[PDB]
Amino acid sequence: PYHPALESLLDTPEIRKIKKLDLRDQRKIFADLSIAQIKRLPRPDIIEEDIKLENDTILRHYKPKKASDKAVLFIHGGGWCLSSIDTYDHVCRYLCDQGNLNIFSLEYGLGPEDKYPAAVNHALYAYDWLYENITKFNLSTENIFVMGDSAGGNLVTIICHERQENMPKAQILVYPAVDMYTKYDSNTKFDEYKYHLTTEWCELFLKAYIGPKKLRQPTISPLFYKDTNQPDTLIVAATHDILIDGIYAYEEKLKQQGTYVETHYDDEMYHGFIGGLGVVPFENPKIALDKIIEFINKR
Numbered sequence: 001p002y003h004p005a006l007e008s009l010l011d012t013p014e015i016r017k018i019k020k021l022d023l024r025d026q027r028k029i030f031a032d033l034s035i036a037q038i039k040r041l042p043r044p045d046i047i048e049e050d051i052k053l054e055n056d057t058i059l060r061h062y063k064p065k066k067a068s069d070k071a072v073l074f075i076h077g078g079g080w081c082l083s084s085i086d087t088y089d090h091v092c093r094y095l096c097d098q099g100n101l102n103i104f105s106l107e108y109g110l111g112p113e114d115k116y117p118a119a120v121n122h123a124l125y126a127y128d129w130l131y132e133n134i135t136k137f138n139l140s141t142e143n144i145f146v147m148g149d150s151a152g153g154n155l156v157t158i159i160c161h162e163r164q165e166n167m168p169k170a171q172i173l174v175y176p177a178v179d180m181y182t183k184y185d186s187n188t189k190f191d192e193y194k195y196h197l198t199t200e201w202c203e204l205f206l207k208a209y210i211g212p213k214k215l216r217q218p219t220i221s222p223l224f225y226k227d228t229n230q231p232d233t234l235i236v237a238a239t240h241d242i243l244i245d246g247i248y249a250y251e252e253k254l255k256q257q258g259t260y261v262e263t264h265y266d267d268e269m270y271h272g273f274i275g276g277l278g279v280v281p282f283e284n285p286k287i288a289l290d291k292i293i294e295f296i297n298k299r
Contacts, residue, residue, distance in 0.1 A: 002194075002240050003268045003282065010270060011193035019201045023112065023208050027082045034087040034275075041090050041278045044097035051104075053129055057122050058107040060085045061137075062096035070296060071102040071139045073130055073159075077150030077174075077272070079205030080119050081111045091277055091289070095147075099293035102137060104130055108155075112208035119209075120219050123155040124162060131166060142169065145296055149174035149274060150243075151205075158219055161228045170232040170299055172292050175241060175271050176250070179223040180206065181215040184245030195240050197271040202242070223250055230254050234295045236264045236288050241271040264291050 018029050047063040072095065076088040085092075085105045092103045106126045109118035127146070134141050146168040148156035153176025160167050191199045210220065218225040223246060233254055237247050254261050266273065269284045277285040 001267050005281075006270055007194040009280065010196045016193065019198075023081050023204055027110075030082055031084060031087055034083075037279045038087070038090045044093055046093065046096050053125065055122065055125050057109070057126060058085065059126060059130070060092070060103075060105040060107070062092050062101075062103040062105070064096050064100045064102065066100050068100045068102050069139065070100075070143050070145065071104060071130065071134060071137065072145045072147050072172075072296065073127055073156070073168075074103050074105045075108065075123055075126075075146075075148040075152035075155045076105065077148065077152045078110070079202065080116070080151045080154075080209035081205050088275070091274060094277060094286075094289055095293065098290070099297065101293070101296065102139060111205070111210075115211060116209050117219060119151070119155055120158055123159055127159045127163065127168075141166070144168055145170050145172065145299075147172035147174070147292070148176065150271070151177055154178065154222065157222050157230070160230050161218065161222055161225045164229055167229065167231045170234070170296065171230065172234045172295065173236070173247075173250075174274055174288075174292075175237045175243060176235070176247060177243060178250045179221045179246035181212060181221050181224075182246060182249075184249075186245040187242045190240050190242045190244070195242070195270055197242055199242060223253065230257065230259045232260045232299065234262045234264070234292060236274070236292065237266070238269045238271050238273060239265050239267045240269075243271065262295060264288055 018026055049061045051059045051061055074092055076083050085107045092105050095101050096103045108122035131141055146156035146159055153173040156171055160171050215221055216224050235251055251261055266284055274285050274288055
């Protein structure tokens with residue numbers, strides 16, 4: 001039941017031209033389009049502050065109006081090469097305001113200028129900094145969550161695998177990239193312009209981020225982690241997505257290892273739809289974000 005209005009939004013001659021450009025040019029074009037869309041959205045009256053870390057990355061702290069006990073480390077998507085904290089401001093503002101959540105959004109190194117494993121090292125450094133400094137925000141280490149979409153879902157689940165002695169309270173994975181090696185059925189079935197994420201476009205990101213059995217390394221494809229625990233997990237995904245079969249594989253691995261896993265699989269939307277919040281006419285982005293909020297606030 002792919003929504004029939006999506007093809008005209010996601011596949012245009014303009015979009016096809018942009019997706020063949022150098023990723024450094026795509027980065028600018030896409031950022032400019034996203035920023036202009038975001039500027040049309042009214043903002044909640046929350047306090048935002050950029051915190052520069054010693055490794056030169058930035059954590060943007062979104063502080064809710066009401067008293068809050070929860071912190072969420074959010075890592076944006078973009079194929080490890082595109083997007084920024086600025087192109088995800090509207091999602092974080094909604095989670096902060098409507099969820100009553102402290103959000104810390106990470107600006108990390110992007111390929112091809114800062115190739116793998118720069119982003120992994122930035123994700124770990126940010127989590128360790130937040131864990132150590134949480135009481136500066138009048139928050140406690142027992143209430144730190146991690147959340148990421150796509151490449152960001154990749155990075156936050158790697159945090160959980162790599163920090164077994166102080167895992168997050170829960171992890172929220174939004175259409176995460178967890179297996180860059182295996183060819184599943186979804187990788188052909190949904191490899192079309194109308195579904196946004198195409199195999200052709202994605203291999204540009206792989207070449208810029210990584211540089212193929214050299215894709216089974218667990219800090220690239222966390223499906224390959226061996227003998228690690230994971231916390232309570234919410235997986236949000238679109239079913240019409242080249243990545244979906246690896247995501248199903250991840251869900252099954254987590255369930256078999258004893259992890260509690262909730263899922264929100266949206267069978268009308270496209271990979272990336274949470275970013276459509278307030279822009280696209282559909283209810284689905286807000287529905288997914290509300291489910292995330294209710295999952296965090298139960299904990």
